[PDB]
């Protein structure tokens, strides 16, 4: 199969772009991989014809939210870079993120979500370099009050990356992502 | 109960603000969260007023030794808050520091101060971001002349961030901090 | 846990208009309107999350056209402390619209004679927001009202100091519910 | 005949500063306060006329550091008439947090975010003319002192704030006359 | 333990007048006060560690009207060795007139003025040291307010006048911690 890639400086950047992904043709979501220092990779797989025309929906969408480090598709890779490299070919209610660099900010800001609407607080992630991301689900109304009321806290705290947020999450994000609504 | 936390670039200056605000008021340090890249947040909690008295009183005093990035009190966290982050509310020797951002400056830090007195390494913490931090522990009159001739012996090796020697830690900081004095 | 949504005027009739607008922008319940002194008048309606964010937002929009617009905010969750304490209608307890606010008693009565002498509509009374300021109510067929409206601030402009003139066609059902217009239940 | 001491201010809240560094100066009765409405409210003391004289006096210095001031005299020996035909009284703790706004809207904001922010209990709201609203908070010192600072923040951004203060302990003689939730009945 | 509160002025007036603030506007105790000679003396608050700086905010803007504030600080958690081995409380009305003098002449005609005035009665004298000396006298607040001013307008031909202060009505733990002529 063809592969795609989108890398981001930021947690919230790389879930909006594996969003628009697989909403943009029929591709898979494998997965993300943490390369450490606040850097992540969106994974996905399929054909040529789907691969190309997501990735670039992806990047398109993702330019908007966080910091876009690489994006690249390989049509065919070789079968020794599947053997040896992750890329998941080795033998739902609304989204609220907010990334902060800074442990203090991501709580303030959690904690002004939990407040503002009724929407529950799943976990947050860890990205490294400092880099922590609270995420939040709920009704398309519900967070979205809640992470400009968030943000607004936070800003006040530490420095604040990426706020953005999903209406309508695709099944193959929550599936890949560790955003509480795993099967 | 009320919520506390101090972000430091610096295991060193995180661990002088979490003994600062323990001996300051009636507050209880959890422990400390490693969000990656050298970054690390000491959380305590109690009431508000005991708190807010507490919480600059550490931060005045982690600005001698390390870079203080975020400082902020939590009056009244809601109850999701502190089911999803581990804030600690879910469902004596003398302390010697030295932190270097390379491994072998802190090596040679730890070897001058075991050869200067008679101090037992305890061990190392690893921050992130290439942040090292070297604990020594012992009586206050080794630890005093062994980090003294520790950081002469480190700063002609790499970079060094931080140096400091705590008499007397709280028996707060032993329990919640690994610091080889762990009942 | 309803939630909130307000809209401020410092004018009965930019409120009314206000009050119009959300609850035909969306599914909103319009509990009643607090008058707070000075003209000022605040409407409050209430429902869910999705709908009380639609609706604020359209009758902003709507009543900048007409009155001097406070403030507009919406509490998606209020607590239950507020519920207690204060009036949001969460607690433990089609004629044509048109109106004429002005900041004297005597503009409003010149302008209420002058509605119902220029087309066939029905002078229901006055609402007195405090401040001096006072608002005539009539009703009748949406040209009527809107013709009597407009023959009526041109006649109370030479006596007072004429506020606001608006004219609604048909007002919601929760409109005349809450409001005293004349069409009560 | 008692004396009689008055402080005017555009505003409940220093008006309730006002009464409480009187009754902690002297020995003076606080018999309540009357409201002439567009914010206007005057809080009235009866008692010795030296008493009185400096009970007003630190009362002044004390309202100046939270809302306007309007007027501040003391009769020593009033006439019988005045007590016969005004309401002037002889006509024969837990810590307090206030928020006043120009803005029923802005005053709902402030009171949402104040009972989220820490354990504070709102009692309720107090109404003084002219869009002056009040909200009335009670709890611990430490409390509402982070309560009302989030509330006067979360409220800049809404309406028009006016006065906020924070008494820690309120005397008994102001509980007793005025609606701060903490009244004996 | 609890917290500590302290106040330092130059002046036996503004101590009590910032004692005074103090015990008003939040719940704490006073437990005394301590002179360390020239002139200085200090109140000593204690409670919770929200009204004591609840309370000692007051008490410091009561005191700069009066007297010459020196120090101002709260201790939230002080150690056990501090309440063990220093005084610090935890060791296991009618009206008020002050006349301070850096001279004992001027407080003694300012003594005789306040007496002279209307009917008070002259508790006596406290010496602060360095000079300073106070005058407290104790009556109804008609008369104690008008013997100060006649006692400061005749003192400032005399010596030399740090402060003059009137209380109506003295908090009840003032007069028990303090010696001002009306302790049980």
Do not use: C, S, W
């Not at 989204?95 to 976990?123: H, P, Q, S």
């Amino acid at each position: 199969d063809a592969l795609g890639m989108i890398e981001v400086r930021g947690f919230v950047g790389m879930v909006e772009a594996a969003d628009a992904m697989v909403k943009a043709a029929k591709v898979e979501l494998i997965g993300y991989e943490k390369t450490g220092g606040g850097y992540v990779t969106a994974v996905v797989r399929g054909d040529v014809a789907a691969v190309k025309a997501a990735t670039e929906a992806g990047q398109r969408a993702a330019e908007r939210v966080g910091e876009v480090v690489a994006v690249h598709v390989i049509p065919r890779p070789h079968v020794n870079v599947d053997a040896a490299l992750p890329l998941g070919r080795t033998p739902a209610d609304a989204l609220g993120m907010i990334e902060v660099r800074g442990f203090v900010g991501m709580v303030e800001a959690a904690d002004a979500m939990v407040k503002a609407a009724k929407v529950e607080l799943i976990g947050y992630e860890k990205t490294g370099g400092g880099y922590v991301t609270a995420v939040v689900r709920g009704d398309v109304a519900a967070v979205k009050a809640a992470t400009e009321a968030g943000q607004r806290a936070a800003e006040r705290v530490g420095e604040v990356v990426a706020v953005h947020v999903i209406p309508r999450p695709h099944v193959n994000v929550d599936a890949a992502l560790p955003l509480g609504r795993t099967p």
